[PDB]
Amino acid sequence: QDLTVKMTDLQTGKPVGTIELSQNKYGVAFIPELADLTPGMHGFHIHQNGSCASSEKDGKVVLGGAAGGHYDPEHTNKHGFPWTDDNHKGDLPALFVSANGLATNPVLAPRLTLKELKGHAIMIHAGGDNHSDMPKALGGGGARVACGVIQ
Amino acid sequence: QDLTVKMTDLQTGKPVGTIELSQNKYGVAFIPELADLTPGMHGFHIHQNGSCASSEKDGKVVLGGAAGGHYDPEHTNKHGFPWTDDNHKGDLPALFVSANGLATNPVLAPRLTLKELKGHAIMIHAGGDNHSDMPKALGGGGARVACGVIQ
Ligand SMILES: [Cu+2]
Ligand SMILES: [Cu+2]
Ligand SMILES: [Zn+2]
Ligand SMILES: [Zn+2]
Fold it and tell me: Nearest-CA neighbor of A124 among A46, A49, A54?
């Protein structure tokens, strides 16, 4: 009754660590133990599909595209904050990566429950997340760099 | 009915921006608009006293020492996570500062209410915060670098 989530770099295919998910009275805490990531803030969201495989868009390969879009059980069709309801329930606070490329700063998602997460995918993006679709869609996270399927 | 919190650098005495505090159904969101800070993660907590003045400890000057310790209304006498109850209610998630010395990443404190915050002080530390008293007390935040009194 622990279940940790192994994360794999989409570009190299090599493991980069794990993320521990735990339920508490305020939501789901995400405890990262990752490495080999670019320093800075990274878009971090739960995705619709339980897959980290690639997808295809107009002839281009989309790493981790098989995961689909941001988990949106309320069909909000919008990207926002982890503490706002009119947006993807999968929107989490951005994940911090140290100069040494390590991510260890835990983060909380008050709108989520652990049970509803299994079968979905955990995504880490190259860009950050300003929790808006402006000026860039999906908080500007851009490409997907790391992914893992919540079992 | 807005009330923003002006932050001042303890070492220079010059303003470094403001932090907006807002109440939502999941807690108090802290929206920073700061500058001139050292890149990286910084300990960020609500303090007991409503003052940012200095204090004195065994002959040494403690900038922002007049603010007292971490806000601890339940007398836990312990430092922990923003989503754990047996520790300072004033323990917030660490604040991120970009390479350009700017802090704009909002953060949420699920255990706090806006009303209980007025009259207290907002503190930003030099070191980070691993949300434990080990290996260093108070999450290793160390010295106080920026402070503001919640009006
Ligand atoms: Cu994503
Ligand atoms: Cu503090
Ligand atoms: Zn989203
Ligand atoms: Zn504390």
Answer: A46
Q: What is the resolution of this structure in A?
A: 2.0
- Of chain A, the end-to-end C-alpha distance in Å amounts to 11
- Of A17, A42, A21, give the one whose Cα is nearest residue A119: A21
User: CB-based contact (8 Å) between B68 and chain A?
Assistant: no
Residue type, A111: R
Annotated binding-site residue? B125: yes
What φ, ψ does residue A81 adopt, rounded to 5°? Answer: -90, 165
Looking at the structure, give the CATH architecture of the domain made up of residues B1-151.
Sandwich (2.60)
- The residue written with tokens 């107009």 in the block is A58
Elucidation method: X-ray
A75 is an annotated ligand-binding site residue: no
Two structure tokens written together for B139: 């999450």
Helix (H, G, I), strand (E, B) or coil at A132: coil
Sorted by where each begins, the domain ranges of chain A are 1-151
CA-wise closest residue to A3 among A123, A115, A146: A115
Could you give the dihedral angle defined by the CA atoms of residues B23, B29, B35 and B39, in that order, rounded to the nearest 10 degrees?
170
